[PDB]
């Protein structure tokens, strides 16, 4: 059998935990102007860009998994 | 009369030579005094320039600002700065020592010039006495 409530609750915890990943805080250099140390914010920004892209897919994949469960409920009921 | 006048005339001739020699030596000493006065004037000017343009300018390459220069590079740089500042102070002290030696040499030459003038006055008075005795002897 398929328990849609338990499955939707687990996929909801997945979407919560993945979106619970915050941005990597950018470094603060007031007096330091060195390019090798200043350019680290570009790596931090590209990291948070890839993470935000995973979070957008996860929000879609959670809906995708929930639909597969209710399709399993509808087609197994027949 | 002929050996007595010739005796005093010979002594007057010697005192005349002593006067002319003392005056010439005094003129040479006075020439050395003038040259040292010139050296003392120009050395004092270069000593003042050594203080303002060298010793006083050292603080402009020190880098004592801890908010702009700190670490091992400052340590290696502060060491060479100390050797540079210590060498400039030593060289100025050397100039001050030579300036004192010049001043002491001027004082010693001025004392010698006065002695040469005193010797000339004695020789001229002796010459006048010998010349008077040689004239009266005939």
């Amino acid at each position: 059998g398929t328990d849609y409530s338990a499955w939707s609750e687990l996929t909801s915890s997945v979407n919560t935990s993945v979106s619970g990943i915050v941005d990597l805080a950018s470094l603060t250099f007031t007096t330091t102007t060195m390019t090798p140390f200043t350019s680290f914010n570009e790596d931090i920004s590209s990291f948070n860009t890839a993470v935000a892209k995973l979070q957008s897919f996860t929000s879609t994949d959670v809906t995708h998994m929930n639909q597969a469960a209710e399709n399993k409920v509808t087609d197994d009921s027949n | 009369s002929e050996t007595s006048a010739s005796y005093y005339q010979d002594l007057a001739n010697k005192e005349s030579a002593n006067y002319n020699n003392a005056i010439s030596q005094k003129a040479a000493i006075d020439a050395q005094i003038s040259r040292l006065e010139t050296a003392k004037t120009n050395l004092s000017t270069q000593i003042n320039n050594f203080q303002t343009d060298i010793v006083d300018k050292m603080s402009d390459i020190e880098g004592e600002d801890s908010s702009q220069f700190k670490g091992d590079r400052k340590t290696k740089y502060a060491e060479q700065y100390t050797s540079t500042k210590s060498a400039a102070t030593t060289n100025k002290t050397s100039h001050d020592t030579n300036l004192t030696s010049i001043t002491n040499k001027i004082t010693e030459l001025q004392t010698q010039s006065t002695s040469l003038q005193s010797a000339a006055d004695t020789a001229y008075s002796n010459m006048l006495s010998y010349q008077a005795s040689a004239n009266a002897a005939n």
Binding site: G1, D3, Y4, A6, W7, L10, V14, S17, V18, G20, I21, V22, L24, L27, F29, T31, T32, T33, M34, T35, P36, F37, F40, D43, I44, S46, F47, A50, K53, L54, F57, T60, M65, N71, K72 | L36, T38, N42, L43, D53, I54, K57, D60, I61, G63, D65, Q68, K70, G71, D72, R73, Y77, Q80, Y81, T84, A87, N91, S94, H95, I102
Partner: protein, 222 residues
């Protein structure tokens, strides 16, 4: 162009704290995805495809993001190593400003000229009265030898500062994040079809991306 190792080490600690927080939140996201694979609330071939998708991509994607944080931390330490090796400056609070060093260098020409001119003048007055009293002119090279050596330090430091400022890191983190982006974009393209689609199922069961993330993590452990 200025650097303060005090600020750099403070950012190293702040970076380690943020990495610790992100690793904890990533582990929570890993456990939530693990609970799906161990759950019996869904069964059938669609559950087999979802389990293959999670174990071969979603969990490795979170693992590789932790590897990206470790790689970014290692690159920050290596950048500190590169600075302390190019400039030869191992101080933990070192402060170096290229403009301030140049300001100290802009006053050397006046001092060098004064030393050379006064040395020529004093040597002239000492030789002019040498027959009256012989006095020795002090050696000016006692000043100019450490003066030039001190100028070399300012010359070498400013040069290495400008030299290190052009140093570049490797593409390790850029190649890791590109692999993350390409994998996520592929999973996006398959989200419109079913989990049991022939092309999508074959992709979900391929464990090459998982083996690649496992190899990055194993290398990090040594």
């Amino acid at each position: 162009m200025k650097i303060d190792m005090t600020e750099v080490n403070n950012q190293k600690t702040a970076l380690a704290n943020s990495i610790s927080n992100l690793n904890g939140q990533i582990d929570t996201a890993k456990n939530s995805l693990t609970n799906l694979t161990s759950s019996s609330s869904l069964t059938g071939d669609v559950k087999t495809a979802i389990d293959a998708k999670i174990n071969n991509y979603q969990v490795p994607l979170l693992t590789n993001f932790t590897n990206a944080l470790t790689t970014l931390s290692a690159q920050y330490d290596k950048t500190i190593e590169q600075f302390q090796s190019t400039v030869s400056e191992n101080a933990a609070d070192a402060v170096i400003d290229t403009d301030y060093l140049q300001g100290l260098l802009d006053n050397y020409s006046g001092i060098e000229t004064s030393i050379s001119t006064i040395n020529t003048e004093t040597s002239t007055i000492y030789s002019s009265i040498s027959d009256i009293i012989s006095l020795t002119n002090p050696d000016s090279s006692t000043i100019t030898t450490p003066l030039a050596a001190a100028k070399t330090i300012l010359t070498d430091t400013k040069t290495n500062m400008e030299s290190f400022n052009g140093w570049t890191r490797g593409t390790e983190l850029a190649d890791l994040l590109l692999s993350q982006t390409q994998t996520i974009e592929t999973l996006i393209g398959y989200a419109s079809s079913g989990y049991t689609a022939a092309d999508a199922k074959s992709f979900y069961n391929n464990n090459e991306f998982l083996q690649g993330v496992n190899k990055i993590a194993e290398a990090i452990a040594n």
